[model samples]
Target: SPYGPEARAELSSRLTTLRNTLAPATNDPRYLQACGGEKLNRFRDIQCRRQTAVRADLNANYIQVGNTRTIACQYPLQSQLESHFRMLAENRTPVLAVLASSSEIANQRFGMPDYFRQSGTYGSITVESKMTQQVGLGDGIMADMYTLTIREAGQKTISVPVVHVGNFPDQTAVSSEVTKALASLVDQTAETKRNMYESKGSSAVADDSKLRPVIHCRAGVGRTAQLIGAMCMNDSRNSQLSVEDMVSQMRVQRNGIMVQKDEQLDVLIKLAEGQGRPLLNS
Candidate 1:
């Protein structure tokens, strides 16, 4: 098979031009000035934020930069990442941006405006889950066990993709549970994506199609890496890297995209296999 370097370069050049043109309009030049990404994982400025958005909405850039085909661990000082999401929505663009911690959420609140049609649970008490027979922290990193959520077009109803992907009881036990959680989140994200996609059929919904999905865990490093990676493979792009390769790429962007724990690695591999592709040309 051909590496398609020239084709990839041509495509990349176009993407670069588009990114520079649109993403930079509102993007803070100061932020770019401070950024010093060097090595494979070297990231841009830490706290500097970018006010850029996908001018085209959930059309091309989302599939390209926000390619849901591979996990992306963007380390834009957390603050910038969250800010960019709102920008995407404002521009009617949809892109998946990961949030690292609770502080990241609290530090910045775009505050969903009223025009956005939101639905309330109408009130919920006990909603049993059929996916998990029991809630057992496998036996790895309990810290990653905590759950985080995001907005999903609702009022007074927070928490869209309630996700939890981390270690397990030792390395071996990590598979089923993590995947179970991932499968669940992916299912939710897929639905959200589906809704967004279908809504595109309507001018009303398409009015703000720039909204993007986001997923993250504790340090925005480990579990965050896993879900985002799987999301990438499931959504768009053609990830040719292995699970570890994807994770490594993320790690280089941020840090510790994927840990050495056999368990977390196992989960990533399962996701990679599910993609029906490999990061390495084995």
Candidate 2:
């Protein structure tokens, strides 16, 4: 049940009024309870090509990253990248993608680049991209930039900046060094896009908007979620919001599991509200 008793009561009454005015037959007794009967069909992921098409709402679960313009999301599949790029291009908004996954060369696993170099066409047009920048970050991280160019009936391009974090194990808390390094990268990303978003005026990004930053790490749900929590903390408007509530809200926008483990949850809690571990130990 997505709604508690009080929320359900409110939703049920609201639905009753709407149904009586709009669709008479829909005002069945089952509608007395919110999400009852056929109304319980819930979506688990954001926009996609198969079945699900609706994206999340902007007001729902979005969290800003450290007062910066950057954000995070699950890694998009090869099929999703082009559409993401096109969405940004159409909106006339420039977005930066920060990837926290390490190089596949060491893991012997094909990573984001393999997905980027994938051959395919978006909207009946071919897709292509070129690597433009690569650099090392404090011996623990690496960064790369790519220009995603699409030339079909029209030509479009969007920048992808990936910050690779190394030596950080999956399903675990990042060391303070790794955390600071990531924060630095996010700061750099924000600096790079400061003018881009500012010049566009003050339009809040839609949940499904590709204009926001795309962040992914392996499954794009664990470490990615931790990083996202850190960024969401910078929002001054959310100063009163508890760390647990923020994470809960984040789950509503994307997947329902941003903080995957107790350790991971503690990581986010500490990062955002400093509620875990003793100061001496920290």
Candidate 3:
């Protein structure tokens, strides 16, 4: 394992320390104030609320991974769904990766609204499902890829790609299938951004922050953090930062329970050891 035994031991120790020492989000006044109320949060676990909340208006956080900026957020309530769409449009995020199942959406678990089933308007933004393709990420783990056409009244209509990896259960060890899907999703998102920049020219590149993808899974912690950790580890530039350091940094930027499970940390360490294939180049 290129990650080495010492690195794994260090990360395991750090995960234990973080779990015991970090304060819950409910105890943080800023999180409480910025999160609006308990009603807006999908999960009541104090560890679920983001500390560096996106905006007083939203229940999300802006997380920086290397040179990229991404949004990590909870699944929005039926009422708050409009703001979520607006947030995506305003930020010009090219992709939204969802790590939840259709069953969860059907049961209304985690307050996930059915935004991709058909065409609908959330406030001034009209979201239409342009296409959906079943992506086989090997190991029989299939993901849904959608081309969502979004139009915000006066603004030019934009298409935001959505990748839904529905089989990921919360707070569990990362599966190789999930890792492959995430890698493909990250690649697709980057390609979308690159295409957008090519067509829009320097103006698109000017606002460097606007095109980052948004990722969410239930309370936007565990699975979300794991994927972010994988993305960081995949980038050669982040080699200096250990798995523990990356998780710690993310916790500081979002919530203390970012990666949540020791099992998840183990997968991240495996990723650091170069154990899984994130992208399949044809």
Best by TM-score: 3
Candidate 2 local lDDT, 17-80, one digit each (tens):
4323332123333212122222211222321111111222110123333233334444544444
TM-score of 1: 0.41
TM-score of each: 0.41, 0.57, 0.84
Weakest lDDT window of 10 consecutive positions for candidate 2? 50-59
How would you encode candidate 1's per-residue C-alpha lDDT over 182-269 as one tens digit per residue?
5455545546644764675734243433334443332334455555555556544545645434544443333322332445555655
Q: Identify the runs in model 2 with alpha carbons over 4 angstroms from their true place.
A: 1-72, 88-95, 98-113, 117-139, 150-152, 164-172, 197-210, 235-237, 273-282
**lDDT tens string, model 3, 1-282?**
335665566556766686556665445654544343436556655433345565555668888766546788887778777788777776666778887777777774345788865789887788888666777665555678787788877787767788887665533465745685676667577666658666967365567557767888777887778888777765656546665567767776776778877677767766765644321111
Lowest-scoring 10 consecutive residues by lDDT in candidate 3?
273-282
How far in Å is the alpha carbon of 88 misplaced in model 3? Answer: 0.9
Error of 3 at 243 (Å): 0.5
Candidate lDDT (C-alpha), each:
0.36, 0.45, 0.68
Q: Where does candidate 3 stray beyond 4 Å? A: 1-9, 19-21, 25-27, 30-38, 46-51, 169-172, 202-204, 275-282
User: What does candidate 1 score in Cα RMSD to the true structure?
Assistant: 11.5
Q: Which candidate is the best by lDDT?
A: 3
What is the Å distance of residue 83 in model 3 from its true position?
Answer: 0.7
What TM-score does candidate 3 reach? 0.84
